Amino acid sequence: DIVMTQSPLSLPVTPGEPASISCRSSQSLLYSIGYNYLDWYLQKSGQSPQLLIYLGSNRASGVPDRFSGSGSGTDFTLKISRVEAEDVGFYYCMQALQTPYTFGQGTKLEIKRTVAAPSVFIFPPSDEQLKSGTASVVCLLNNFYPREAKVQWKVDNALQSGNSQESVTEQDSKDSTYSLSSTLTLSKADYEKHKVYACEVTQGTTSVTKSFNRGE
């Protein structure tokens, strides 16, 4: 199997700066003069891969000027002359010289931007859910930067541990921010044994808390 290795795996770039993603193959991909069997693909979050470049340097249909490929034999470079925020996603090289076709590991393009604090929202369990026997309390962190943020649930000011799970979106293609959702899961019984439900979000040494009283 031809082994493809990509450099870097993570590429933080400021919009407007160039980017360059490199691919090495373990065997030469030059089949004939002008025929290097290497392609570049982009996969944006929650989408299919799309072809950027084929045969080392041929830009596919509808791909912007900004993208170009070069190289020969065992070494190849995808270039982005001027990175835009909508370019965020994963980039893979693939050789098609031989079956099995084989991919590089992926390079995640990350956009650098200014810090943005999240708009925070807390959601109590629905009465519909409570009827089942369980309560999920949800905390939304909307449109922040950078990725690092700490979510701490507090129940009647007691710090919770081990009863929450969270997940985060990929960087937004327009504003380059992340969002995060956290769910605190309690039995209905436990939920009804307490009053104040609080989500505290920390970025650096600043902490923002949204809460509600189960009663009111």
Place this chain on the structure above:
Amino acid sequence: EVQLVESGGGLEQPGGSLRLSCAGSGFTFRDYAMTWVRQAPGKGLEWVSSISGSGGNTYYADSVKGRFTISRDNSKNTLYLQMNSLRAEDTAVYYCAKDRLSTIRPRYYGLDVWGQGTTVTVSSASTKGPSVFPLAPSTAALGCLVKDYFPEPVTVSWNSGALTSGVHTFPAVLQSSGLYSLSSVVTVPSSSLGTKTYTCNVDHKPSNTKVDKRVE
């Protein structure tokens, strides 16, 4: 536009089998080799299989040889993948892609067109459709909580896809119950909360659960 639409993904037991399909339109199907590429959860791309335009030749990754069988029906513009002796490692989104022109020597334009994919989960657990609960509160957030379903995936849209700006649909988390739970939120002008309805459109094909929940 050339388009590829995959179908046939879902849940099956280890040892079991399933067939995937991929319908092509917008091109002369029989002229082109057709390829399957898969993506295990949170991993990169892996080539699975190809088959020439005519079906003269088939090609498989080492790990799928013999238990997977590619096919095509040129008269219905349809590619197939018979997946037998299923393993945990076959859990992935499977994509179909248009491959080389099958001229005395084939002509290669990259994997120029890709399907939207179809998710295959290999697990001894059983199918379970989600509950959908509202997330009720100059900007307001509202959402839906899609709780307790198996396997992946679920899709969420808002107002039948009309509403796109401000939507975050989060990565599902696997709870300790072995079931998934996902949230989808949108930020909306607070002013219009009385003059405009917001409906989440949840689909979980594996359970045939298709739910529209108005959030008040």
